[PDB]
């Protein structure tokens, strides 16, 4: 995925951030959100 500039401690926290970046799947890794390209 693409790393966005949003901090997280679990993947559910990346749902809205990834949607704000135009994307629908992702996960929290290394305390950052990563989102699957549209």
Curated annotation (Swiss-Prot):
Annotated stretches, region: Interaction with Ca(2+)-activated K(+) channels: 26-33
InterPro entries, per database record: Scorpion_toxin-like_sf, Scorpion_toxinS_K_inh
PROSITE patterns on file: SCORP_SHORT_TOXIN (PS01138)
Pfam families listed in its UniProt record: Toxin_2
Cell compartment(s), UniProt: Secreted
Tissue expression pattern: Expressed by the venom gland.
GO molecular function: ion channel inhibitor activity; potassium channel regulator activity; toxin activity
Chief site of localization: secreted
A cellular-component GO term for this protein: extracellular region
Keywords annotated in UniProt: Disulfide bond, Ion channel impairing toxin, Neurotoxin, Potassium channel impairing toxin, Secreted, Toxin, Voltage-gated potassium channel impairing toxin
Disulfide bonds: 8-28, 14-33, 18-35
Extra information: Negative results: shows weak inhibition of large conductance calcium-activated potassium channels (KCa1.1/KCNMA1) (Ki=1560 nM). Shows weak or no inhibition on Kv1.2/KCNA2. Shows no effect on Kv1.5/KCNA5 and Kv3.1/KCNC1.
Entry's family note: Belongs to the short scorpion toxin superfamily. Potassium channel inhibitor family. Alpha-KTx 03 subfamily.
Function text: Potent inhibitor voltage-gated potassium channels Kv1.3/KCNA3 (Kd=0.65 nM) and Kv1.1/KCNA1 (Kd=41 nM). It appears to block channel activity by a simple bimolecular inhibition process. Induces a transient period of fast flickering in the channel openings, followed by an almost complete blockade of the channel. Its binding affinity to rat brain synaptosomes is 5-fold higher than this of KTX-3. Binding of the toxin to the channel is associated with significant structural rearrangements in both molecules.
Domain text: Has the structural arrangement of an alpha-helix connected to a beta-sheet by disulfide bonds (CSalpha/beta).
Protein name: Potassium channel toxin alpha-KTx 3.1
């Amino acid at each position: 995925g693409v790393e966005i500039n949003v901090k997280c401690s679990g993947s559910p926290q990346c749902l809205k951030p990834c949607k704000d970046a135009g994307m629908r799947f992702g996960k929290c890794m290394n305390r950052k959100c990563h989102c699957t390209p549209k």
